[PDB]
Every structure is written in C-alpha cells, then in structure tokens.
Amino acid sequence: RRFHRHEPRDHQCSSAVAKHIKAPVHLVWSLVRRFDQPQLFKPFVSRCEMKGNIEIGSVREVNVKSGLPATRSTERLELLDDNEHILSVRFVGGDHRLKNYSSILTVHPEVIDGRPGTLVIESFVVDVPEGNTKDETCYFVEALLKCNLKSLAEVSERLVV
Amino acid sequence: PVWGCASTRGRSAEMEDASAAVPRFADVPVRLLASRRDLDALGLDADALRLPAHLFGVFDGHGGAEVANYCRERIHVVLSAALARLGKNLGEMGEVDMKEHWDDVFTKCFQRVDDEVSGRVTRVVGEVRSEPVTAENVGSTAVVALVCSSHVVVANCGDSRIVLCRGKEPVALSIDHKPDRKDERARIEAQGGKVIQWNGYRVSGILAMSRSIGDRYLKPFVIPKPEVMVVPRAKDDDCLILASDGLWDVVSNEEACKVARRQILLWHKNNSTDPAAQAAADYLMRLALKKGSEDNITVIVVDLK
Numbered sequence: 001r002r003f004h005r006h007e008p009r010d011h012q013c014s015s016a017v018a019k020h021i022k023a024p025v026h027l028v029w030s031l032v033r034r035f036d037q038p039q040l041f042k043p044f045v046s047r048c049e050m051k052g053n054i055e056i057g058s059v060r061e062v063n064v065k066s067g068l069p070a071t072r073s074t075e076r077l078e079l080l081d082d083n084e085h086i087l088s089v090r091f092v093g094g095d096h097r098l099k100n101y102s103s104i105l106t107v108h109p110e111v112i113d114g115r116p117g118t119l120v121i122e123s124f125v126v127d128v129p130e131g132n133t134k135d136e137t138c139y140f141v142e143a144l145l146k147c148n149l150k151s152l153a154e155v156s157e158r159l160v161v
Numbered sequence: 162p163v164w165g166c167a168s169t170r171g172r173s174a175e176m177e178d179a180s181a182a183v184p185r186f187a188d189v190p191v192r193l194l195a196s197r198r199d200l201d202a203l204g205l206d207a208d209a210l211r212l213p214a215h216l217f218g219v220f221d222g223h224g225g226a227e228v229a230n231y232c233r234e235r236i237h238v239v240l241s242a243a244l245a246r247l248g249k250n251l252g253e254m255g256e257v258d259m260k261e262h263w264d265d266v267f268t269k270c271f272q273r274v275d276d277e278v279s280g281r282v283t284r285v286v287g288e289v290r291s292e293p294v295t296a297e298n299v300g301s302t303a304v305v306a307l308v309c310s311s312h313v314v315v316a317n318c319g320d321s322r323i324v325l326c327r328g329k330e331p332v333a334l335s336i337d338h339k340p341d342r343k344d345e346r347a348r349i350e351a352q353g354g355k356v357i358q359w360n361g362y363r364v365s366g367i368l369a370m371s372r373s374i375g376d377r378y379l380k381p382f383v384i385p386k387p388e389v390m391v392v393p394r395a396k397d398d399d400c401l402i403l404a405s406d407g408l409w410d411v412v413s414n415e416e417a418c419k420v421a422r423r424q425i426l427l428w429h430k431n432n433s434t435d436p437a438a439q440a441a442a443d444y445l446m447r448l449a450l451k452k453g454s455e456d457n458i459t460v461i462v463v464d465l466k
C-alpha cells in the first residue's frame with residue numbers, strides 16, 4: 001500500500017482498483033512492461049507511437065478508439081522498476097480532461113485457487129476538471145481502469161493455455 | 162417498397178457504420194395491423210393471414226465494426242422467426258393489444274441478438290459458437306424500420322434516428338437514447354450507475370448513449386431494450402430517412418426532409434435500389450460531409466409515395 005498512497009489536495013481526487021489474475025506475475029509483468037504497446041491489454045487503444053528505446057522520460061502518443069470522450073493522449077514514463085514490477089506513468093498531453101493525471105501500477109505474487117497467480121493494483125491522482133465532482137472523476141477513471149485490468153486479466157489468462 | 166442507400170466512411174480512419182435493406186424479410190400477421198373486429202367485418206379473421214414486410218436498418222458501431230455488422234446480418238432473421246412464431250399465437254386471443262405485442266417481439270429480438278453478441282447464448286455458424294463475438298467494449302446502435310402496406314413499425318436502440326417526412330412536417334419516429342434523458346438517467350442511477358457530463362452526458366462518463374447492442378462492460382446500465390413506435394401510413398407520407406448521427410449531428414430533421422423530398426421530386430421530373438431515392442440518400446450524405454461532419458455517414462431513404 002506504500003506505493004498506492006497518494007497525497008491528494010482538495011481540488012484533486014485519488015483512488016485505486018485491483019484485479020486478481022490467474023497467471024504468474026512475470027507473464028503479467030511481461031505484458032505491462034511493454035510501455036510502447038499499451039494496446040497489448042488496453043481495449044480503448046487503437047494506435048501508439050513512441051520514438052527511441054524505453055527509458056525513464058520516454059513519451060508515447062496514444063490514439064484511442066471511437067465512443068470515448070477523447071481521441072489522443074500524450075503520456076510519459078515516470079517509473080519502471082523491472083525487479084519490483086512497478087510502472088508509473090503521467091499524462092502530459094492530449095485532448096482529454098485528465099489534467100495532471102499520474103498513475104502507479106504494481107504487480108504482486110498471489111496464490112489463486114491453489115495455482116500461481118497475480119494481484120495487480122493501479123492507483124491514480126488527477127485534477128478534478130471544472131464542472132465535475134470528485135466522485136464523478138474517480139468514477140470515470142475507475143471505470144476505464146477496471147476495463148483495462150479486466151482485459152489484462154483475459155489476455156494474461158489466454159496466454160497460459 | 163422502394164429505397165436508396167448511401168454510406169461513406171467520410172473523414173474518419175475506420176468504417177464502423179453498417180446498414181441493411183431486406184425486402185420481403187418476413188410475413189407480418191395481419192392481426193398485428195388490424196383489429197379482429199375490422200377483419201371479421203370482411204370475413205378475414207378465421208384463418209391466419211399474413212402481409213409481407215420489408216426491413217431497413219442502420220447500425221452505428223463504436224469501438225469496432227463487428228457488432229454493427231452482426232446486427233445487420235442477424236436482426237432481420239431473428240425478427241422474421243419471431244413474427245412467424247407469433248402468427249401461430251395471435252388467433253388464440255380475443256382482442257390483440259398490438260402495441261404491446263410489437264414491443265415484446267422487438268424486445269425479444271434485440272435481446273436475443275445482444276445475447277448472441279455477448280456469448281450468453283450459442284449461435285449457429287453446421288457449427289456452434291459460444292464465445293463473445295468481440296471485446297466487451299464494442300457496441301452498436303440499432304434503428305430498424307419495418308415497412309408494410311399499412312404501417313411503419315420503428316424499433317430504436319441508441320442515438321441513430323429515423324424521421325418520417327409527412328406532408329409539410331417531419332415526424333421523428335425515434336427518440337435518441339442519450340444518457341441525459343430524464344427517464345434513462347433515472348433508470349441508470351436507480352441501478353447504481355452514474356451519468357456524468359464529460360465532453361457530453363455519458364454513462365459512467367464514457368459512452369454517449371444509454372442503450373445499444375453489446376457493450377457488456379457497461380451493463381446493466383446500457384441495455385439493448387428498444388423503443389418501438391407503430392405509425393399507420395397516410396397519403397401525406399412522402400419518405401422515411403434512417404441515418405446515423407453522422408447526418409443528424411449536422412443536419413436537422415426539417416432540412417433532411419425538405420432536401421430528400423426535393424431531390425426525389427427533382428429526379429422524377431428530370432427522369433435493388435431506386436435511382437431517385439438513391440439520389441436523395443447520396444445528396445443527404447454529401448450534404449452532411451459539406452457541413453463539416455468528420456464521422457461515418459449512413460443514410461437510407463425509403464420512398465413511400
């Protein structure tokens with residue numbers, strides 16, 4: 001929990017979503033660590049471009065699919081601990097209403113139904129846009145994150161069989 | 162019995178709009194169109210009479226085109242089978258509540274198609290499939306118009322719209338299922354969901370409509386239950402306009418009606434689909450492009466007179 005304890009100010013909101021996955025942690029992490037290919041598990045991503053190798057400070061340009069409140073987002077890699085399985089990303093651009101969005105995703109070992117499994121936790125802190133409440137912003141972000149972690153679980157478990 | 166269909170990807174990267182035009186897709190039990198008393202007056206109430214019907218459909222897909230295409234391929238088959246079965250049951254009722262029966266047959270049809278899409282029921286492909294057709298975040302609007310000699314029956318599910326150009330006045334045969342609707346907001350919030358203003362009113366701040374086929378990741382807030390409107394045909398009726406929001410977001414009902422009627426009359430005075438109605442649909446599509454739409458555009462025009 002020490003990695004998902006943000007200190008939000010009153011004009012912001014912060015929350016977290018979790019997902020249990022019936023797959024070993026190094027497979028799920030092998031998926032999550034591909035900073036250049038978020039479409040690997042994000043259902044809303046249609047295209048992603050990134051220049052150079054993946055390093056702290058790398059910036060990917062993401063295009064999302066139809067039926068969404070936005071089309072593109074510019075996201076920078078803030079942290080990638082390979083052995084601790086920690087990925088932290090900050091939104092730095094795009095045409096969306098998620099200003100100062102920062103997220104931390106951690107992958108942990110866990111026994112599920114007697115078999116090797118994975119606990120994924122993703123927390124975030126974001127500025128509440130003008131006109132919305134905290135509950136609305138956190139609800140919207142939690143919905144997108146829940147979809148992303150559900151898809152990550154399905155792709156990870158399909159890669160085990 | 163005469164229509165034209167214009168459809169373009171437009172200024173978009175992908176095509177996720179689909180449409181259907183199936184003539185004689187089914188035989189409608191006449192007891193769904195006339196009361197048993199008016200038919201008994203002509204002695205046409207003992208056996209099971211049937212009147213052939215045509216089906217037109219527009220399906221605005223999002224997150225992909227798989228669900229829209231599937232609706233185009235399946236909705237008319239399922240609806241035809243359902244009407245066929247209901248024909249063997251209308252004769253067992255002293256008085257037929259026609260509107261409730263249309264609502265039930267379209268609701269069961271749309272729910273069946275949605276269950277096939279989500280994988281809750283199996284589907285026939287000599288082979289059977291049970292997995293979902295596509296990802297949970299893929300969905301589609303569905304507006305269908307059953308046209309027959311006596312009535313037009315409209316089933317709407319989403320923000321695509323159909324307009325009847327009647328006389329000097331356009332009559333909307335479907336109300337857009339945007340989540341900001343008072344009854345739809347009441348339903349969604351009553352189920353524990355949220356309607357959030359996030360670049361438009363959206364379910365959970367994500368989807369800009371409250372009803373669609375598929376989109377199982379937003380259930381039970383997004384439902385595939387359609388709203389049905391039964392309208393009798395009159396000699397005032399000129400044409401039907403079925404379109405996705407690629408037209409309605411930039412063209413109003415009145416402008417679409419006057420433009421389509423003028424284009425049909427112009428083609429007729431100057432001179433399988435119909436050439437005049439096709440000219441009307443093409444004119445509407447290119448008019449939506451000219452106004453500045455960056456969306457997929459699908460327009461079906463059905464000449465009634």
Ligand SMILES: CC1=CC(=O)CC(C)(C)[C@@]1(O)/C=C/C(C)=C\C(=O)O
Binds near residue numbers: 042091
């Ligand atoms: C799906 C989508 C819709 C938006 O309105 C904003 C944005 C384009 C940023 C987003 O891609 C959001 C992505 C989020 C919250 C998390 C992620 O995927 O890591």
Ligand SMILES: [Mg+2]
Binds near residue numbers: 221223
């Ligand atoms: Mg679409």
Ligand SMILES: [Mg+2]
Binds near residue numbers: 406
């Ligand atoms: Mg619209």
Ligand SMILES: [Mg+2]
Binds near residue numbers: 221405406407456457
């Ligand atoms: Mg559209």
